[PDB]
Design a protein around this ligand. Structure first.
Ligand SMILES: C[S@@+](CC[C@H](N)C(=O)[O-])C[C@H]1O[C@@H](n2cnc3c(N)ncnc32)[C@H](O)[C@@H]1O
Ligand SMILES: [Zn+2]
Lengths: 96, 93, 107, 86, 81, 97, 82, 107, 93
DNA sequence: ATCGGATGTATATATCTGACACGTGCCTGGAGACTAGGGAGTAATCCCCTTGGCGGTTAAAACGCGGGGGACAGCGCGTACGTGCGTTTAAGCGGTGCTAGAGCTGTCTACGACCAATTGAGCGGCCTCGGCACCGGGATTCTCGA
DNA sequence: TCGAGAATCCCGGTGCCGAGGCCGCTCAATTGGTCGTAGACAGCTCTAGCACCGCTTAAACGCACGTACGCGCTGTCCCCCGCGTTTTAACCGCCAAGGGGATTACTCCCTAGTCTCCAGGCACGTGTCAGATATATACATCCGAT
């Protein structure tokens, strides 16, 4: 009955940290890889276990960014990440 | 034709320290890929170290001084002692 | 103990035959010494034994017999000096270490 | 047969899929502007990996980006991936 | 009716009436966007016009002369001198 | 007297030190700091006199590359100071400790 | 002689002279003990790999190249000493 | 152009004699091809030419003739491509790029 | 003893682009230790590309693909085209 | 403090499944014998560079003071993110077809290793001088209390 | 919106040494020969990737709403900057001394290379068992109302 703002999220976190399936879906991510690989060759043919190795290496990086988005958004004394938090964590790490 | 692995040599050491416990096939491929990666860190580091002193031989002395660089701390004090035990027990036997 | 299969002369379970092959046709140096694949196969035994001790250790806590990759990340990231060795790495289909930052926990 | 210039497959990385990657990172409240910023940071990570992943095949004279070559592309950037060989 | 000279040192000028480069064509504004330091290249001093600020695409350059102001700028002295 | 305001001896000494090269940690408290830490690994090690300066230059250009990362992490909290809850952020982001 | 507390010779201006090169404006005075807890952590990693490259070479002198290989180990480099 | 000194056959100023030596007694692979030290000496010519173009370029701004190491960091960090190539590196006795964060600038 | 360097060879490229300027001996040791670093990243990377494909030769094609792996963007495209311009003066003449 | 639901979460059977631990065959890589050989160890010199000391000189640190501003808490607002409920619209799936490309075998031609025979560019050593350190007058200018 | 102040800039003269230019001089570069073998061909088999389709519904999508969090605006006080005075150890330039690095020169023994042997271990076909859904349930944390 419209449980409180915030504790669906802490029930959502403990589900997802205790599970290990892949979070981005297979077919939209397979069309993102076949879009970005059009710039570097035309009519490539991805071997279908190399659109898992581009998934489990990419969402293990996006998760590892949100662990470092959250540590700097806590640092600004709030609980809301923002795009001025992400571009700190990419800049301090040295992706710029 | 044939693709070699470290699949069986992991499997004896699994049944050595956990003699009832199996392993999967995806989590064998990690432990196959982990052994190949600690090789090319150690034999990489023990190759440049042979070059910096202008020797041409990876002897046992280099891999003592390549484990002691990569392996951080308490794994370094063990895997040196697990090495020189096993290089005496090869030589004396 | 034995004469054939130089691992059995050393007392390892990792092959010293394969490691002495992979120090020559990997082109690491010119002339690999005879003691060198013995020392290297013992270290790769020990780090595989250190992981698979801690891997099946955290398989009994989740009460399953066989080891899935999720147990390997729980053996690696929970350790204090295997986390430094596998610092850069991502273990495929392996989850994360369960933690919340404790500011976000309720009152 | 079909010359489809594929565009806007980036909008398949959906707003309830950046929420669940946020949850596995363990973060609580997400802004409205994250969802068009993470796709800017996803398309930068995939551009660097696939450009190396193609180059490893284009040198090897194949037309398949096989999973040995994605793993080698990730190993060169210092993000090793255990699980597919090496 | 145009001062197409310059100064390197106080003895000699760089004329730009008949000869010259395309560097002469930029005019005066009292607010600067370019200066010209005198550098030496192999015994003889060329005169080189740098920038001060990030000039944009088709943003018209300025130059101070430092001896009216027909720039149209308000924040300026109303003359050249 | 003629008092410089709080703030513009700082923004002079920023623009002085960023426009300069030379070493900022004095050498004799770095010659005897390196020999403290080497005395816990191998006793009675001599140092080549270049190999102190190779340690000084790689430590001066580490701490500068740290302080450029706290000051982005401090401005992020709308401050102009830097506190030790910034260095322990900018090292945790960069994967140091 | 066995020495201690040499790290307080990295004195309170010499942290703040270093921090101006980073381009910081105000320095809260608790920094001067966090920074010496960072320079000691960093010099323990470099010198212990620098001693190890001498210990292999059977020497009693940490030469100039044996720091540059110990820096190339950790992911820095130093151009200038060989 | 010439016959001796392969660099002069290629038109480089970097030696192709030394590079073909340093691809054999560096032990990089078994059998280095004949075109391989030519291509490698041309690239090391070009990256040295790209730096020393930009180094003395910012030597002219300073107004000094010779290049000190301070000019090299001003040539490397001001250029994006070079910066990417030399990302990890520290150029010894070389200062920093002059910048202040613009929040700290006055009103 | 004979300790070689790239000292004179950098000097003949400084007296091409900027034919009046000189170079300090500290900023010679940087360029002597720059060339010694881009060597080990090009021959270091083109010793994996001629090992993953089970070749055994560093040909002149790997040093092309080593350069397009390391060098970013528009330094790759100009140094690739500086390469094949200079190996074709080698093959013809 | 605590009720009343209450509701998803973690704790127990069921039982089917297709992943895995296991049993046969074989084959190729590992093991030994031994050979020549060069690379490393082990002496030896020798002298270069580091450790130690000290006598200065003084830049620099250490200290204390005032005063100012920046941090930090508080409060109130308003907006926008969460919650969910209701509803679409592909994802997933499995299934069959299809074929373009990957892998392997085998021929066979170019080509890099290697040897010696020669030598000439490159390093080391030595002279030398001009580019920059190093300070003085002044002109600007950069802030701040008028 | 500014005149006194002071730090910086800048331009100058005079001096230092370290960049640059040569003189001889050795070993590494050249080459011109053999030599097999690595890679380059076509060629062929096949399998794995792609294209498609029907379905089933799990998940995205949109909207409404109310609520808590961000933000901004305050005041406070504390603590950091600024600066003068005294203090002290860094620095430079001596000294000298000897340890250890660097090279040379015998010497030898480890190992590379080759062959002869053979079983370890690879892929394959096998049953079987520890799973994961499929299913009702006991109770932890959560919530509106008290
Ligand atoms: C130094 S020349 C400039 C080049 C010249 N305007 C041309 O483009 O050929 C001087 C000329 O600039 C113009 N000028 C000088 N001061 C100016 C100002 N403050 N605003 C606009 N024009 C100016 C004068 O008319 C004079 O003829
Ligand atoms: Zn005007």
């Amino acid at each position: 009955h419209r449980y409180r703002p915030g504790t669906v999220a802490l029930r959502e976190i403990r589900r997802y940290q205790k599970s290990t399936e892949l979070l981005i879906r297979k077919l939209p991510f397979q069309r993102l890889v076949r879009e970005i690989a059009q710039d570097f060759k035309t009519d490539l043919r991805f071997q279908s276990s190399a659109v898992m190795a581009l998934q489990e290496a990419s969402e293990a990086y996006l998760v590892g960014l949100f662990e470092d988005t959250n540590l700097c958004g806590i640092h600004a004394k709030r609980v809301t990440i923002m795009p001025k938090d992400i571009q700190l964590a990419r800049r301090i790490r040295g992706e710029r | 034709t044939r693709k070699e692995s470290y699949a069986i040599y992991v499997y004896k050491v699994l049944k050595q320290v956990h003699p009832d416990t199996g392993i999967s096939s995806k989590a064998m491929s990690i432990m196959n890929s982990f052994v190949n990666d600690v090789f090319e860190r150690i034999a990489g580091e023990a190759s440049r170290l042979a070059h910096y002193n202008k020797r041409s031989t990876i002897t046992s002395r280099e891999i003592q001084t390549a484990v002691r660089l990569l392996l951080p701390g308490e794994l370094a004090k063990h895997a040196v002692s697990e090495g020189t035990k096993a290089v005496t027990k090869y030589t004396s036997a | 103990a034995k004469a054939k299969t130089r691992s059995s002369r050393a007392g390892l379970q990792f092959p010293v035959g394969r490691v002495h092959r992979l120090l020559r046709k990997g082109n690491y140096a010119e002339r690999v010494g005879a003691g060198a694949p013995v020392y290297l196969a013992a270290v790769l035994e020990y780090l595989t034994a250190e992981i698979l001790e801690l891997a099946g250790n955290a398989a009994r806590d989740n009460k399953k017999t066989r080891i899935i990759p999720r147990h390997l990340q729980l053996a690696v990231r929970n350790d204090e000096e295997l986390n430094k060795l596998l610092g850069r790495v991502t273990i495929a289909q392996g989850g994360v270490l369960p933690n919340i930052q404790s500011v976000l926990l309720p009152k | 047969r079909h010359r489809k210039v594929l565009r806007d497959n980036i909008q398949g990385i959906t707003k309830p899929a950046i929420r669940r990657l946020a949850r596995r990172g363990g973060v609580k409240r997400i802004s409205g502007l994250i969802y068009e910023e993470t796709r800017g940071v996803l398309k930068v990570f995939l551009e660097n990996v696939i450009r190396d992943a193609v180059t490893y095949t284009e040198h090897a004279k194949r037309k398949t980006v096989t999973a040995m070559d994605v793993v080698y592309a990730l190993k060169r950037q210092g993000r090793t991936l255990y699980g597919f060989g090496g | 009716g145009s001062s197409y000279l310059f100064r390197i040192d106080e003895n000699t000028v760089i004329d730009a009436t008949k000869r010259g480069g395309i560097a002469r064509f930029i005019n005066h504004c009292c607010e600067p966007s370019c200066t010209a330091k005198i550098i030496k290249v192999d015994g003889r001093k060329r005169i080189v016009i740098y920038a001060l600020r990030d000039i944009g695409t088709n943003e018209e350059l300025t130059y101070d002369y430092k001896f009216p102001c027909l720039c149209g700028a308000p924040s300026c002295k109303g003359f050249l001198n």
